[PDB]
Amino acid sequence: QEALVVKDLLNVLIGLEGTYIRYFNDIEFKIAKKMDPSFKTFSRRIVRYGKQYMILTRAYEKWSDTSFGMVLQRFAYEIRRFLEDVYLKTLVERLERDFNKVPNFSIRELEQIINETEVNKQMELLYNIYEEIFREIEERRTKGGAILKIFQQKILENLGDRSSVMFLKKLLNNISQDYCTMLYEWLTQGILNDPYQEFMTYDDWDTQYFIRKDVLLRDCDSEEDKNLLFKMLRTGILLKVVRASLQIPTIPSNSSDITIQEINDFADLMEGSNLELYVDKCYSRANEIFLKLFFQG
């Protein structure tokens, strides 16, 4: 009886699909339950892990297939690849040891370990994201700084658990690398980057740029926050105009404040203060160069 249950348990645990395990398009896959009270209870907890694994894969396709949101993808691919590597190695090794020894052997110790690492990282991420996706349908019915901000809020809730913040920080960093490159492009060479927009300034002879209000980022709204932003923008416009100045070619290569900026791009930047300190420094140089160019030559 008991033997039968454990053989049945191993088979359940891999979480294969079928005709006996039926599909509801949205609960998801569900199967009939009918076990010992002992096993049935454990099977309920377990059901929760499995459900996330399945939800996650689903989530993953959505975020990356031929989606838009360069940033959005960049996170999704990296997370899917990391979760797959840990889970796959661990699980495989575990099923084989259990089958090999005797045809079945108990899950529970194995599960506990695997469970902590997996559970914590993945679950937290997907839960925020689910709320944000819902929110987007609601905005549409009736961005960049907002993604950074949401990540910042998440670190801030996380605080005091080493594991979580270290993982999250590493994902933040890679994502920040894209941000650092666009910032860097702008501050050193006056060029923004837009596949399908990744800034809230869009170009409208000599051209101009303006901010498209609907999408407009969460991070920079308040009167004070906007004034500060205007000054930041003003350095950015000055930099794009310096690029226009390639009528008499300019490719910046003169001894400037360059090294510092290159370190900064590498840094992972998520600080208002450090960055603004940096823009001032860059600005001063950009204006001095503009002036030198104008005044003579």
Added chain:
Amino acid sequence: QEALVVKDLLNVLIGLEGTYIRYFNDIEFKIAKKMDPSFKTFSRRIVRYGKQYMILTRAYEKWSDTSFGMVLQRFAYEIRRFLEDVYLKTLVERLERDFNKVPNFSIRELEQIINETEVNKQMELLYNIYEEIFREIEERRTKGGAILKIFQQKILENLGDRSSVMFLKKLLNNI
């Protein structure tokens, strides 16, 4: 069953002639097929490589034996000598490693590598040539600059593949 098939496979792959493998003077040699669906499909692709190898040797005799076309020969001897050196070394080494380890071992990785280098150079050359030979019978029924020209057209189709044009250019050069 499986063991038998692989031992049978090694033997097939060298592409020896015989009474069981019969001769049609012009399809060429053909043998009865009767394998696993898996093996039978692979054996079809493979059949294509082998067919060229055999066609090529045939082609080679024609172009050089006591032929005329000084130029025509000069190319043929050089190409036959180069294809033989690469194929011979590679193949020999491969059959021995496979037999040696265990009495048979799988072809496929070995074949893929060998296949690219071989396939591309030889096939392209012989295909143009077959058309030109046909054309000559047709002219006769009803030269120098033309050989250079045909080679020039061939480089021009080839363009954007390093390997091909470099080989072809080297033959062009000697000629």
Added chain:
Amino acid sequence: PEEDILKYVSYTLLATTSALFPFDHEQIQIPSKIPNFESGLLHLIFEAGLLYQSLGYKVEKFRMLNISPMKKALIIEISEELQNYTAFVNNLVSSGTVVSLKSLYREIYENIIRLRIYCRFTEHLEELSGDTFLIELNIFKSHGDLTIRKIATNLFNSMISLYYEYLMNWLTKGLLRATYGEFFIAENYHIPIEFNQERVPAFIPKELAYKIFMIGKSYIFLEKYCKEVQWTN
């Protein structure tokens, strides 16, 4: 029966069916053993087999000596990628451990992803002919993701070389080749040679291209004037 099933499966991924799979010019229509457990594995395998069959179909198609050197460059890149697979097949064999179907999936995820993207390009290409391949290359190149963007960059590098060749012809010997409807110089008693401004790219600026047009044009014209032109230069 897993080991026997694995040899059949291994052969299947190469696109050659087995005695227990009804894969034809189509997927596994049904599995000869019917369990749910196998079936669930079977869904992911069926997609996999289908793609192998498609790649072969496409390759064969393009090997019919049809359009652009741009197109050729693409055949060479895909052809390179199939090398990786093969490598994976000896690597799975090389393992020497019993490998499950579960295991097979995990180990070869990365190829499912790259391969699938390469089909997206291929479907759109079926419509496109000539200079449109160049716009499609430009957009694709802009998209991030390190691997995806990396593939896209590799395709760009082999093309830019096709251009440099056309340019090289143009600037030095007043010679130009437009083949299947790329570059930007068109001919047309008439007998003139001129620039197609809509086709001038701005990747290399339109202004820059216009100066180049004048210079190539001038060279050919000089030759027609007198054979003996400024030589060694």
